[PDB]
Design an enzyme around this catalytic site. Sequence first.
Site, short mmCIF file in Angstrom:
data_model
loop_
_atom_site.label_atom_id
_atom_site.label_comp_id
_atom_site.label_asym_id
_atom_site.label_seq_id
_atom_site.Cartn_x
_atom_site.Cartn_y
_atom_site.Cartn_z
N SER C 21 0.83 -1.19 0.00
CA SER C 21 0.00 0.00 0.00
C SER C 21 0.87 1.25 0.00
CB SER C 21 -0.93 0.03 1.22
OG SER C 21 -0.29 0.58 2.35
N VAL C 22 0.34 2.31 -0.59
CA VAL C 22 0.98 3.63 -0.60
C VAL C 22 -0.03 4.64 -0.07
CG1 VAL C 22 1.99 5.45 -2.00
CG2 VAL C 22 2.52 3.06 -2.50
N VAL C 23 0.38 5.42 0.92
CA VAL C 23 -0.48 6.40 1.57
C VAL C 23 -0.05 7.79 1.12
CG1 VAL C 23 -1.21 7.40 3.76
CG2 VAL C 23 -0.93 4.93 3.55
N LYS C 38 -5.68 6.27 0.51
CA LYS C 38 -4.85 5.08 0.51
C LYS C 38 -5.05 4.32 -0.79
CE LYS C 38 -4.73 5.85 5.02
NZ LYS C 38 -4.01 4.65 5.55
N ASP C 139 -4.56 -7.08 17.11
CA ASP C 139 -3.34 -6.58 16.47
C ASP C 139 -2.94 -5.24 17.06
OD1 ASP C 139 -1.42 -7.58 14.69
OD2 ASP C 139 -2.04 -6.17 13.12
N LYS C 141 -0.50 -2.93 18.49
CA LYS C 141 0.94 -2.75 18.50
C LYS C 141 1.27 -1.27 18.58
N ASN C 144 1.11 0.40 15.24
CA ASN C 144 -0.21 0.42 14.61
C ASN C 144 -1.14 1.46 15.20
OD1 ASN C 144 -0.80 -1.05 12.32
ND2 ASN C 144 -1.14 -2.99 13.42
N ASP C 157 -5.73 0.16 11.13
CA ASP C 157 -5.47 -1.19 10.62
C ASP C 157 -6.62 -2.14 10.97
OD1 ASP C 157 -4.19 -3.27 9.32
OD2 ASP C 157 -2.92 -3.77 11.03
N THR C 176 2.67 -10.22 15.68
CA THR C 176 4.02 -10.03 16.18
C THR C 176 4.37 -11.18 17.13
OG1 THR C 176 3.44 -7.68 16.15
CG2 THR C 176 5.61 -8.28 17.02
N1 LIG Z 1 -3.54 9.26 8.04
C1 LIG Z 1 -2.32 8.76 7.82
N2 LIG Z 1 -1.32 9.63 7.51
C2 LIG Z 1 -0.10 9.14 7.28
N3 LIG Z 1 0.32 7.88 7.32
C3 LIG Z 1 -0.68 7.04 7.62
C4 LIG Z 1 -2.00 7.39 7.88
N4 LIG Z 1 -2.76 6.27 8.16
C5 LIG Z 1 -1.90 5.28 8.07
N5 LIG Z 1 -0.63 5.68 7.74
C6 LIG Z 1 0.54 4.82 7.57
O1 LIG Z 1 0.24 3.86 6.57
C7 LIG Z 1 0.42 2.53 7.09
C8 LIG Z 1 -0.93 1.95 7.44
O2 LIG Z 1 -0.80 0.52 7.59
P1 LIG Z 1 -0.79 -0.44 6.34
O3 LIG Z 1 -1.80 -1.57 6.59
O4 LIG Z 1 -0.99 0.31 5.08
O5 LIG Z 1 0.66 -1.10 6.40
P2 LIG Z 1 1.27 -2.57 6.49
O6 LIG Z 1 2.68 -2.61 6.05
O7 LIG Z 1 0.32 -3.50 5.75
O8 LIG Z 1 1.13 -2.88 8.05
P3 LIG Z 1 0.63 -2.18 9.39
O9 LIG Z 1 -0.87 -2.49 9.46
O10 LIG Z 1 1.35 -2.94 10.51
O11 LIG Z 1 0.93 -0.72 9.36
C9 LIG Z 1 1.37 2.70 8.26
O12 LIG Z 1 2.73 2.72 7.82
C10 LIG Z 1 0.94 4.05 8.83
O13 LIG Z 1 2.02 4.71 9.49
#
Ligand SMILES: Nc1ncnc2c1ncn2[C@@H]1O[C@H](COP(=O)(O)OP(=O)(O)OP(=O)(O)O)[C@@H](O)[C@H]1O
Lengths: 97, 993, 372, 78
Positions: C21-23, C38, C139, C141, C144, C157, C176
């Site tokens: 994923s890319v945010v 997202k 989950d 963490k 998270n 998440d 984890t």
């Molecule tokens: N509103 C937001 N602004 C900036 N970054 C965000 C925002 N919401 C989530 N993120 C970032 O995007 C990611 C959200 O989790 P994502 O499921 O996309 O990642 P993952 O690698 O699958 O695992 P994880 O769930 O452990 O983060 C995280 O890295 C989080 O820091």
Amino acid sequence: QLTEEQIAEFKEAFSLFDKDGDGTITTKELGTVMRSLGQNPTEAELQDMINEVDADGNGTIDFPEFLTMMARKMKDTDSEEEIREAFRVFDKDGNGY
Amino acid sequence: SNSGVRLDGYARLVQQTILCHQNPVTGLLPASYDQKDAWVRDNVYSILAVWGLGLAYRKNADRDEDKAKAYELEQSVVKLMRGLLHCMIRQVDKVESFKYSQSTKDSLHAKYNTKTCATVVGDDQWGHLQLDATSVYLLFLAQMTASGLHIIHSLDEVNFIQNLVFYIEAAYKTADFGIWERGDKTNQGISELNASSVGMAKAALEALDELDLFGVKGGPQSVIHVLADEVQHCQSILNSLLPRASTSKEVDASLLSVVSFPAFAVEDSQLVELTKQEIITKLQGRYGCCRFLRDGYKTPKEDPNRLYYEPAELKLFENIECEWPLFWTYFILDGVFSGNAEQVQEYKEALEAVLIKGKNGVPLLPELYSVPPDRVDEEYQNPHTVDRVPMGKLPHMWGQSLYILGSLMAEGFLAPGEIDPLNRRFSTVPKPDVVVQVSILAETEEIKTILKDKGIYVETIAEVYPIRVQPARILSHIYSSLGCNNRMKLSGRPYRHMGVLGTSKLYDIRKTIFTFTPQFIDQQQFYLALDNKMIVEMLRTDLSYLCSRWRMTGQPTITFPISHSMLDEDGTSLNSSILAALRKMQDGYFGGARVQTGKLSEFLTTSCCTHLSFMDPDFKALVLQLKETSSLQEQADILYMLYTMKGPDWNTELYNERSATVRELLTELYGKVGEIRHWGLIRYISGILRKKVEALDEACTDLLSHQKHLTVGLPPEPREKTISAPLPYEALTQLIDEASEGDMSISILTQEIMVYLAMYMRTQPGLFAEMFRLRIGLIIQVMATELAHSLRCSAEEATEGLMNLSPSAMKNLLHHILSGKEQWQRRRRLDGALNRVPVGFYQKVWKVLQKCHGLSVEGFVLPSSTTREMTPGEIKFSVHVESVLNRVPQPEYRQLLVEAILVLTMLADIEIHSIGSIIAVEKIVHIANDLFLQEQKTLGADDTMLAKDPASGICTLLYDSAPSGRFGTMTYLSKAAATYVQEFLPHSICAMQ
Amino acid sequence: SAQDFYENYEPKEILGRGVSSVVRRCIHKPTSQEYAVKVIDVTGGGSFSPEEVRELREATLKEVDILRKVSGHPNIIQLKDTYETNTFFFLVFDLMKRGELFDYLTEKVTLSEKETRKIMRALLEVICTLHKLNIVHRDLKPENILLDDNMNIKLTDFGFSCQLEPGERLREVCGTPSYLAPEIIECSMNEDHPGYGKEVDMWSTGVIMYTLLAGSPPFWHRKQMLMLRMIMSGNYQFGSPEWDDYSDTVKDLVSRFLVVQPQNRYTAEEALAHPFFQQYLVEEVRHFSPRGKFKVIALTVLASVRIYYQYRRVKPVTREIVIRDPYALRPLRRLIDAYAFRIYGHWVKKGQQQNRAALFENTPKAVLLSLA
Amino acid sequence: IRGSRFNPILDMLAALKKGIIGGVKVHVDRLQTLISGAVVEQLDFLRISDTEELPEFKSFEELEPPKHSKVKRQSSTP
Ligand SMILES: Nc1ncnc2c1ncn2[C@@H]1O[C@H](COP(=O)(O)OP(=O)(O)OP(=O)(O)O)[C@@H](O)[C@H]1O
């Protein structure tokens, strides 16, 4: 574990600590209380005490901080020393009681 | 009328102040005083008041006197411009010589003489390299041409202007002497990059993008063609290089000329406000603003009859710098231009007091105000308290002209839309969005059918006869013949590569629409295009780049032919990555851009189309063995030996019917290897062919724009010279080859690594943070060591595996190493090898040197007397500290010294005292090691646990020990430092807080 | 459709990255808002079979369904708008200017008492709200959980979280390696234990509190087997020089939050009822016999005498003690720990291999480490 | 410029920009450049008029963007 009576006593002590109700013991109020009791702590000593009691440098004392301070365990020797000091302070007159 | 009276008074003032020194025959105004020399920048800035007065007078037409006055003013401006043009065409040889191999000895002289238009000084007694003056001259010429004045007048003059544009466009990767013509703070015959120069050059290129110099009557043969890639590179350079003045100056008052009325070459208005606020905070005074911090111009000391001041300016020129009201005039111009009224009034009120009267009560702007020699200590102790005195050029033409223009602007007689007909005032308006168009073309019928049964409709190379598609090299060769004049010995634009911003636009030549593919799909130039993941990744990158700026008018268009190289092993379907990219783009979204599939004819309705008017009409035994040998790697090896001994260009005589040279055989071998996709001899072939990555100089200047140092190859003491300034492509390639020596493939690996570093710097400028110098040789050694550790193989096997890995694998490994992710000994070794240090490490070291006599690293010494000479924000101090700490060749020992320095700084923060002696960090770490060994012996560890380093005498457990903890190395280092301090204290401790 | 999302949301610079994923930030053109979008792909670049694509689609639809189930909670992240395309997922959320709790924690090493109090209070609120709707997150963490400008924590998440029904237990092994209960390992031994439950979230809260307070995870080892054995055995211990200067209520709360037995573990409502989260403003029913007044006066005198001894009990610099042991001085220990973390603050990311407890080595590196 | 009529307007504008439209050659440039250097007609009779108050003439003014819908010139949208 604590008790309701202990909580009420702590709240009453916190309320009586400061002349005016603002949620803080205040350095000026503590100094006035110390002078009324018959003690004249130094300004540096008072500042050091405030810094040590407080968890950071904000310079204010809250009721949870007072409760945590009163929750410390003195063991045995510190307890008897404290009660002896309290008795000596209370026994200003030469009567032994 | 009252307005007529005010205009007459302004005209009289202008005539009595500036126009009185018109200097006929030539028309170049003297630069005040008894100088008898003409500066092009000074004359250009002085003529602004005359041009504004003429523009104001032109409005009140219909009268003979007013028409005559306006005509006289316009003709005076035209005569000055023509005199400057003659002056500049007098150095066509210099311009043409600077066009190739950019060097300070090839540029035209900045100082020009008076009438007879000759050269007044030699080529080595002055700094004859100022691109800012020529660029601002070109920009103002464009502004006057757009206004209506006729200045550029001949086709030869048009060719000269085009040559000047080609000469100036390389400003983003060269170092000049700046506006002050003194380089950095210390002259020392050195030059450095300046933000003002590149900004004004970018603004000039934008002004002359498609300007018609002949006016409304001009034709297609009298227009300038300016590329957009160079301007975007300059914009990027400025954006990454405008939190301060330059790489050496923390702030310069000349930065106002980039973020104000002159050339308006800035975006991100928040950055403009921040720059203005910092300039006001660090430079504003009681009589104007100082030029820059630590300047000795016009001082009561430093032997005014001397040049190339020695590095002794620790406090001599501090807090007593002169102030110039021209920056106050610039501030009032900026206020009166955009939207400000109260600021204009306050700045005018402030400036009216610093004005000095002249003959017949004429206002005059003094050059600067200087502190009297007697009241120097008072100013040093009490800044901005003493009273200065006027000195220098009393009738400052530049400042007087700027003040006159500002007063005329404020009085309402002139509008902001007159001086700026090229609507540059709205350069700070945010860009809403941009939609990019792409097209996919099939080389053959089989590719089109394979795309068809997969649900994608494309058009083949044929059937589009009105449109022709060629690679970018043809476009390059075409642009190389622009502005070519045989009579004037003009060679035109040199052969240079073009970015994705150039090939996107459509081109019309000989009444035919031409579309050019992006330059990156050329597998002949380099093997980077072979990898499919590389193709899709940097395709996304260039798509993002195109979507970001797109400063050029019109919609863009991208063509992506599907060749025969990315098909699968069976050669019957497309690869997963390219198919996924096509499917993603089909949904109107790819990376960070919005795209839409379509047909080229459909995009032809609305797109960016440009018309190029200038294009209108025993040896035999060795050969037999090479022919008959198997093991293609050994075949390439034998080819390399043959090329080395007697095969530079001699024919091998392998064939009988046709004589094919060695280059033809090398090309055939490369083509054959490209089909099998085996990365065993590709690097060898690339090294033999001496193929160089395109835009290497662009990557180097992008890396250097962030105040970074680069070193080439493994470091010994003598060789591996560092690079601190941008360097031409030929010299850069020569340095790379010299560093690589006979390893040839080392050069190719280095090229790949630095191009990856440049690519990663733009996308993620956080991984390279805290890093001051980057060494390719150390990085190569580190990756080889890591791969050997992973495979548990030898060094030769590690090198072979590194060679065999695909470029995508190289990028992934470099990214993983840069992130530092996957025991403590290995981590310390990686940290030391990359010389990673905390951000505040330089400040901590500077404070320690301030509070201590010096530091001993078991060899040489670092004196504390250098803290006054340098500053914590100066890169020279940082590089000196790094060089001092780089003597030890053990990365683990370097990290140990770094943490010892950190704990010593923490202690010095704890204790308020002066050490007054030299402390040896080596002795401290030795004491810590001895204490750790004693503690381990006391605990019960045996002889096998208390190991000794073969060449450092340090226990392995110390390296394996975690940093913090109850028994961490931090506690031992603190104990050792405290013990050393106690040993160097008068039998007591002085630590109190 | 995709055209509506493109015309309504403007892609911007990348704000975060995930496994696939890319945010990136987005701007709502009608409102000029600062939301976040997202982007998650389907085919993964053609690297996986369509079964993986359909599994990812099912996971995303379950995530959006669960999130829409709990929509409207200010503490819980809200899904403003959702979109689905053939080869891309587009989701709209609320963007925050602050980073995740991992970044704030690694910057501050250890947080203040008020901060940890409010953070566990908010976490208890969100977990009890989820329990009211019969949802398990499992989950929880430090990475998270995010923060905003108001220092308010919002769980995210929700792709993992799924709906549950009474009487059913899940069996998947995941998460984890340091955030698992004895229940999961008992279920996954061969087949014996039934499945998942509720107390996994309780131990997640406990380990969150322990990590935030002590600065390191309660369980961490160089070997996976050793750490899973330690977690299953439930032999956690409180640090001697770190947990001394804290009130006993936090030790008690952590101890009941790390109980190995799911039955004996405190419920979220029970945790909320503890005096740690209890606050008082004003009351007028504090009336009793003169014996109560005498007891209150005696306690006040005792507290006054206790605070009368605080300043005289302070210790001097004691430079010699610093020579013998720098860990005696708490401010010095905090300063050296902060400096060490700042030196090595770029190696704290997702993954059990490297974490905060890796930087700390309380165990002595002697011959005793060989025994295992 | 709204609706399906967006394309013909662009076609006409492109024809004007090319140089010849409808068999007539035209030139496109900035207004200020065209005005300068050209013959201007003089109307001096207005000054000679004896009217106490000079009549006010309303010129063409820029239209401010709306603050309710803020239609920023969206696509054609047939
Ligand atoms: N509103 C937001 N602004 C900036 N970054 C965000 C925002 N919401 C989530 N993120 C970032 O995007 C990611 C959200 O989790 P994502 O499921 O996309 O990642 P993952 O690698 O699958 O695992 P994880 O769930 O452990 O983060 C995280 O890295 C989080 O820091």
